[PDB]
Scaffold this active site. Structure first.
Site, PDB file in Angstrom:
ATOM      1  N   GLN F   2     -54.840  -4.411  -3.373  1.00 22.29           N
ATOM      2  CA  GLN F   2     -54.184  -3.863  -2.198  1.00 22.29           C
ATOM      3  C   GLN F   2     -54.179  -4.866  -1.054  1.00 22.29           C
ATOM      4  O   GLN F   2     -55.078  -5.703  -0.935  1.00 22.29           O
ATOM      5  CB  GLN F   2     -54.882  -2.588  -1.744  1.00 22.29           C
ATOM      6  CG  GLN F   2     -54.997  -1.538  -2.807  1.00 22.29           C
ATOM      7  CD  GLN F   2     -55.706  -0.303  -2.314  1.00 22.29           C
ATOM      8  OE1 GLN F   2     -55.107   0.555  -1.675  1.00 22.29           O
ATOM      9  NE2 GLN F   2     -56.994  -0.204  -2.608  1.00 22.29           N
ATOM     10  N   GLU F   3     -53.157  -4.753  -0.201  1.00 23.27           N
ATOM     11  CA  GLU F   3     -52.979  -5.566   1.004  1.00 23.27           C
ATOM     12  C   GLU F   3     -52.997  -7.060   0.676  1.00 23.27           C
ATOM     13  O   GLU F   3     -53.842  -7.819   1.154  1.00 23.27           O
ATOM     14  CB  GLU F   3     -54.030  -5.222   2.065  1.00 23.27           C
ATOM     15  CG  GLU F   3     -53.890  -3.839   2.663  1.00 23.27           C
ATOM     16  CD  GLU F   3     -52.880  -3.791   3.790  1.00 23.27           C
ATOM     17  OE1 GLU F   3     -52.457  -4.868   4.255  1.00 23.27           O
ATOM     18  OE2 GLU F   3     -52.511  -2.675   4.213  1.00 23.27           O
ATOM     19  N   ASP F   4     -52.062  -7.451  -0.187  1.00 25.23           N
ATOM     20  CA  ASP F   4     -51.825  -8.818  -0.646  1.00 25.23           C
ATOM     21  C   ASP F   4     -52.985  -9.402  -1.438  1.00 25.23           C
ATOM     22  O   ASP F   4     -53.046 -10.615  -1.616  1.00 25.23           O
ATOM     23  CB  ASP F   4     -51.475  -9.762   0.511  1.00 25.23           C
ATOM     24  CG  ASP F   4     -50.359  -9.232   1.374  1.00 25.23           C
ATOM     25  OD1 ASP F   4     -49.696  -8.259   0.959  1.00 25.23           O
ATOM     26  OD2 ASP F   4     -50.143  -9.784   2.474  1.00 25.23           O
ATOM     27  N   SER F   5     -53.911  -8.587  -1.924  1.00 31.12           N
ATOM     28  CA  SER F   5     -54.871  -9.118  -2.872  1.00 31.12           C
ATOM     29  C   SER F   5     -54.245  -9.178  -4.260  1.00 31.12           C
ATOM     30  O   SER F   5     -53.159  -8.651  -4.506  1.00 31.12           O
ATOM     31  CB  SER F   5     -56.141  -8.274  -2.904  1.00 31.12           C
ATOM     32  OG  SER F   5     -56.893  -8.408  -1.719  1.00 31.12           O
ATOM     33  N   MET F   6     -54.940  -9.835  -5.179  1.00 30.09           N
ATOM     34  CA  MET F   6     -54.505  -9.861  -6.563  1.00 30.09           C
ATOM     35  C   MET F   6     -55.712  -9.805  -7.480  1.00 30.09           C
ATOM     36  O   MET F   6     -56.819 -10.196  -7.107  1.00 30.09           O
ATOM     37  CB  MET F   6     -53.658 -11.099  -6.873  1.00 30.09           C
ATOM     38  CG  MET F   6     -54.379 -12.416  -6.732  1.00 30.09           C
ATOM     39  SD  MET F   6     -53.231 -13.783  -6.510  1.00 30.09           S
ATOM     40  CE  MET F   6     -52.122 -13.091  -5.293  1.00 30.09           C
TER      41      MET F   6
END
Ligand SMILES: [Mg+2]
Ligand SMILES: [Zn+2]
Ligand SMILES: [Zn+2]
Ligand SMILES: [Zn+2]
Ligand SMILES: [Zn+2]
Lengths: 165, 144, 118, 97, 171, 147, 107, 167
Positions: F2-6
């Site tokens: 979430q929120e540009d994590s991977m």
């Protein structure tokens, strides 16, 4: 600086028109004698105050640190043996200064100053009993004697209008 | 001669001289190696100008130059005032000779160490009574 | 040094923008015994504020962490802050609050008499 | 890490005065300096081993206070003294609120 | 010189002493560093008078230390020396620099320049003393000395004595 | 993620996905300030050198340089340099007449570690000997690497 | 109160201050065409008495300078004939509390 | 209150009655009013401190020649005063050795005899402390007595006090 000679910044117009702002050296008698009076009075007062400081006991000075120590602060710096005064920094036994040994020497210096300055005070005694005319640049020109023939300094004074210093 | 004014970092518990001292620069602490007791904390590890006190000595001088808003008459008057200084005339002529050292070495494409060696050779041999009547070019060439 | 194209905003650095536009009594005197508002005419709230609660809990925990006597029975509690909250819960904190009015006058409110409504 | 001006503003808005004081003093630079009661300047010679204090000029040895200020504050005050400004610090009020 | 004065002291109590009888720990803690304490502003404080009621008001907690600050006001007997005052005492130590005389709780040093010239040091005597044509200045000897200069730090007071004036010296 | 994590495969990371080499070169020179005040590439000893860094010096050779291939850890000395000092001083307490030099060595970065890849001895334009030491490490992708 | 047409000669302003307690207020006809107090943005200004001002300063433990200010050229201040040191109780509609009484002192 | 530096003042001298700004004749007590500065002579100081010590001993319990008096005041100090009593013990042996008057009656009647003088409390405390035998001796010992007391009154006061001193 000692006000024995006053300076005048008058520039004139010689016939060759190569004028420069020459300076005129002369004496202001009452200002000079007041300066002499103040200087000798401050000299004798400073010598009296030095004599008073020499009347204070010797005190101490630590030779390692080259710092003086008065008798008041020596007691706060004495050893546990109650025998020697030790330095705050060097921890060295204090040696005695010479505040009082030279007190008679300073008094004799004052005495040898006093008889030498006696003609000066005699002159001021005769001056204080008389009236001194406050001379200026114009007054000093009355008793003027010129020193050289081709003098570029024209002693004729030029009054001006507009100067309100 | 003179006051001591020296601070020695000895452990007040180990009482071992010379003290085993470890300088923790990362943690900003000076500690005793034997027992771990700290001795001085908050130790200090840009803002001024570089100055080597072997080449030009302890000479600290600044020059006057044009700023963002600068009138040239003030700058000229201050430059003439600073030029008319008498106490650094020897400093002025040794700086002129150092400038001549650098100009002669740069015209010869000599490296920087040659300039440093020639400058220190001039400074050590400067103001010698045995070396007074020789020409400036002789001192130049011999120092180089 | 460093050379990064990822633009990081220099915080606290508005001086660049500042330099871009540079041109465009009756009741109480001294420190007498009069300064204390007496208990019968205290006009501040009887509720203990969040700041008062935070500082009483901090002060009591700092004392408890410095081996102060504890006036409540511990139930195996160890954290000084939790002991302080248990003391505040049953009103055993022996402190008072000096609430300074803006003219310098103050009311002394004990922690015991203040109501913990939050 | 930089505890900037607007971080300080956030702690002001929170109302955490003691945490702000701890950040600015016990976390960056806590300096103990001595001042005398007569002149507010920091020109007090302190010899803590000998327990001797003295401010020259005032010539007082019994009216000395120690304060805890940031070292940046001490540097600011000494720089102000270099600019012929006296930042005299006093430990008692003089006027009403 | 002995005086009775009302004094106020700021006392810090550790939080460990926040007990049910905090006032008696506070009074004892008033006792051990005021009884016999030396303050340059008020002289050597000797004894705290009127123990039964002592003005202990509400004490302020220090905001970062946690200790309670009490400004205890009290009446105590002090001994403050002054210049130009005449005090009697007994010599407790002697040296070539001079001798120290104990006056009340305080020791005053009389320097070698502040005895009359007939008095001179005799280190061969056991104990070492100052001997004159008419009297001796030994240890445990009553002597009347005038204080002509005293220096007081924040916690230490030292004075300079002299016996060169007439109607002074040994008693 | 979430929120540009991977979420990136750990097994793929183990097999070389986005694994990278990292090389950092360290430069150092010995400069002649004067006649006797000149720097020297050598392995310093605690007996006669002041202000030695608390990192190890055992990985250095007789020339003051670490050989290529040697694993280095944080704050380890990779270039050893000494400059002479004024004799008969009193600094830090641990000062004696034996200490004729001070440590001017170059340590590794405190957070960095790796393998010395290449050490390059040469002279500059002035003729002063100067060295360059390349340290190789591998950045295996982990939580917090930007992709 | 003097209500003039266009302007006054400036040589009459020097004699506008007269002997106390007489006060002279000059108003332009054009400036007085519309009552500004009837505007919806202008709230009700009520001048306080000396005892009311004293009670206001006592109950809020205030000084003269700690009050909010209104300058002695404000159109409402000239409308009410405010003198220096007088306090008006400003009552305005509040979107959070309905009625809000504020106070401004005439500087 | 003004924030003037006011760093200029005369030095504290007992001859010129200057004992400091914290030693004026009028002293503000803890109950508020101005009250006369209390200067004790050595016998008076010994009696006051001994009364304080026996009062503290009585509070602890509820909660003459110099030789027999020194041991009594020493055991009183041990049973009454705790640590840092070295200065207090030196003071008590000092007041025992330099004790002009022994009991309270002599000291109190000396106070009411010196209150007929109407002089400064410091100089009458010095008179009760110093054992001067002649008026000029007291004048040169205490410079405050110059142009303060008549020579015959000073002579009769000193010879009276010589009659008053016992043992
Ligand atoms: Mg982002
Ligand atoms: Zn020294
Ligand atoms: Zn150790
Ligand atoms: Zn000062
Ligand atoms: Zn210093």
């Amino acid at each position: 600086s000692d006000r024995l000679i006053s300076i005048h910044k008058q520039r004139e117009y010689p016939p060759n028109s190569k004028s420069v702002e020459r300076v005129y050296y002369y004496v202001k008698y009452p200002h000079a004698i007041d300066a002499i009076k103040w200087k000798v009075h401050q000299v004798v007062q400073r010598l009296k105050d030095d004599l008073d400081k020499n009347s204070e006991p010797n005190g101490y000075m630590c030779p390692i640190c080259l710092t003086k120590y008065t008798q008041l602060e020596a007691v706060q710096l004495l050893n546990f043996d109650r025998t020697e005064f030790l330095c705050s920094l060097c921890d060295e036994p204090l040696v005695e200064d010479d505040s009082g040994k030279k007190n008679k020497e300073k008094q004799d210096k004052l005495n040898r100053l006093m008889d030498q300055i006696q003609p000066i005070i005699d002159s001021l005694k005769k001056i204080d009993d008389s009236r001194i005319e406050e001379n200026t640049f114009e007054i000093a020109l009355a008793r003027l004697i010129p020193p050289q023939n081709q003098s570029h300094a024209a002693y004729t004074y030029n009054p001006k209008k507009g100067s309100t210093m | 001669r003179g006051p001591n004014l020296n601070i020695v970092l000895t452990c007040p518990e180990c009482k071992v001289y010379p003290p085993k001292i470890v300088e923790r620069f990362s943690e900003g602490d000076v500690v005793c190696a034997l027992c771990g007791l700290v001795l001085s904390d908050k130790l200090v590890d840009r803002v001024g100008e570089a100055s080597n006190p072997l080449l030009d000595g302890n000479n600290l001088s600044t020059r006057i130059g044009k700023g963002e808003t600068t009138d040239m008459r003030f700058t000229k008057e201050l430059n003439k005032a600073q030029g008319k200084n008498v106490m650094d005339k020897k400093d002025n002529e040794v700086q002129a000779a150092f400038a001549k050292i650098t100009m002669l070495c740069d015209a010869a494409e000599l490296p920087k160490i040659v300039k440093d060696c020639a400058k220190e050779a001039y400074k050590l041999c400067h103001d010698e009574k045995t070396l007074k009547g020789k020409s400036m070019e002789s001192i130049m060439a011999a120092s180089i | 040094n460093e050379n990064f194209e990822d633009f990081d905003v220099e915080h606290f650095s508005d001086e660049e923008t500042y330099e871009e536009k540079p041109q465009f009594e009756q009741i109480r005197r001294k420190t007498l015994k009069e300064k204390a508002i007496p208990k019968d005419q205290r006009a501040t709230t009887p509720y203990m504020t969040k700041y008062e609660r935070a500082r009483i809990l901090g002060t009591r925990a700092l004392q408890i962490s410095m081996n102060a006597p504890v006036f409540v029975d511990l139930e195996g509690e160890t954290d000084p802050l939790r002991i302080a909250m248990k003391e505040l819960a049953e009103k055993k904190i022996p402190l008072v609050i000096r609430r300074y009015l803006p003219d310098g006058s103050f009311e002394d409110w004990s922690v015991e008499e203040l109501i913990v409504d939050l | 890490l930089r505890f900037g001006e607007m971080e300080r503003d956030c702690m002001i808005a929170h109302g955490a005065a003691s945490f702000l004081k701890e950040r600015l003093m016990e976390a960056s630079d806590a300096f103990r300096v001595h001042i005398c009661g007569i002149c507010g300047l920091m020109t007090v010679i302190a010899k803590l081993n000998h327990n001797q204090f003295e401010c020259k000029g005032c010539d007082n040895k019994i009216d000395i206070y120690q304060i805890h200020i940031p070292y940046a504050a001490k540097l600011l005050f000494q720089e102000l003294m270099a600019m012929n400004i006296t930042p005299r610090l006093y430990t008692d009020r003089s006027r009403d609120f | 010189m002995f005086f009775i004065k009302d004094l106020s002291l700021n006392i810090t109590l550790h939080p460990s002493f926040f007990g049910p009888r905090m006032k008696q720990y506070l009074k004892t803690k008033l006792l051990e560093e005021v009884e016999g304490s030396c303050t340059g502003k008020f002289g050597y404080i000797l004894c705290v008078l009127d123990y039964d009621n002592i003005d202990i008001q509400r004490g302020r907690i220090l905001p970062t230390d946690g200790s309670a600050e009490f400004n205890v006001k009290y009446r105590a007997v002090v001994f403050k020396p002054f210049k130009g005052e005449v005090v009697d005492g007994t010599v407790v130590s002697c040296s070539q620099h001079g001798f120290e005389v104990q006056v009340g709780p305080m020791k005053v040093f009389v320097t070698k320049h502040l005895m009359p010239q007939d008095l001179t040091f005799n280190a061969g005597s056991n104990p070492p003393s100052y001997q004159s044509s008419e009297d001796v200045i030994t240890i445990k000897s009553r002597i009347r000395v005038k204080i002509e200069g005293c220096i007081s730090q924040v916690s230490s007071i030292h004075a300079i004595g002299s016996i060169k004036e007439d109607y002074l010296g040994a008693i | 993620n979430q929120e540009d994590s991977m979420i990136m495969n750990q097994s793929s990371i183990d097999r070389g996905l986005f694994r990278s080499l990292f090389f950092r070169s360290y430069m150092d020179q010995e400069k002649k300030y004067g006649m006797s005040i000149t720097e020297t590439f050598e392995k310093p000893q605690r007996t006669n050198t002041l202000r030695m860094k608390h990192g190890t010096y055992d990985k250095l050779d007789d020339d003051g340089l670490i050989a290529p291939g040697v694993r280095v850890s944080g704050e380890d000395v990779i270039i050893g340099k000494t400059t002479p000092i004024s004799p008969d001083e009193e600094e830090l307490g641990q000062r004696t007449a034996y200490h004729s030099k001070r440590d001017a060595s170059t340590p590794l970065r405190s957070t960095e570690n790796g393998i010395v890849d290449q050490v390059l001895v040469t002279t500059n334009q002035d003729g002063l000997k100067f060295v360059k030491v390349r340290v190789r490490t591998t950045k295996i992708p982990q939580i917090g690497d930007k992709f | 109160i003097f209500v003039y047409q266009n302007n006054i000669t400036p040589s009459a302003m020097k004699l506008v201050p007269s002997i106390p307690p007489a006060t002279i207020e000059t108003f332009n006809e054009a400036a007085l065409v519309v009552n500004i107090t009837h505007h919806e943005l202008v709230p009700k200004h009520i001048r306080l008495s000396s005892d009311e001002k004293r009670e206001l300063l006592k109950r809020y433990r205030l000084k003269e300078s700690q009050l909010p200010r209104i300058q002695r050229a404000d159109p409402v201040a000239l409308y009410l004939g405010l003198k220096r040191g007088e306090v008006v109780k400003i009552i305005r509609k509040s979107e959070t509390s309905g009625r809000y009484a504020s106070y401004r002192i005439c500087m | 209150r003004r924030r003037r530096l006011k760093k200029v003042e005369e030095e504290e001298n007992a001859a010129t009655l200057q004992l400091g700004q914290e030693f004026q004749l009028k002293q503000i007590n803890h109950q508020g009013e101005e009250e006369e500065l209390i200067a004790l002579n050595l016998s008076e100081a010994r009696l006051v401190i001994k009364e304080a010590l026996v009062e503290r001993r009585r509070a602890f319990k509820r909660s003459e020649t110099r030789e027999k008096e020194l041991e009594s005041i020493d055991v009183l100090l041990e049973q009454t005063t705790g640590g840092n009593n070295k200065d207090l013990k030196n003071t008590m042996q000092y007041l025992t050795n330099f004790s002009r008057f022994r009991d309270q009656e002599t000291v109190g009647a000396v106070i009411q005899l010196l209150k007929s003088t109407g002089l400064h409390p410091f100089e009458v405390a010095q008179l009760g402390s110093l054992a001067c035998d002649t008026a000029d001796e007291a004048k040169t010992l205490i410079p405050s007595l110059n142009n303060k007391i008549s020579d015959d009154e000073l002579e009769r006061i000193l010879k009276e006090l010589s009659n008053l001193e016992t043992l």
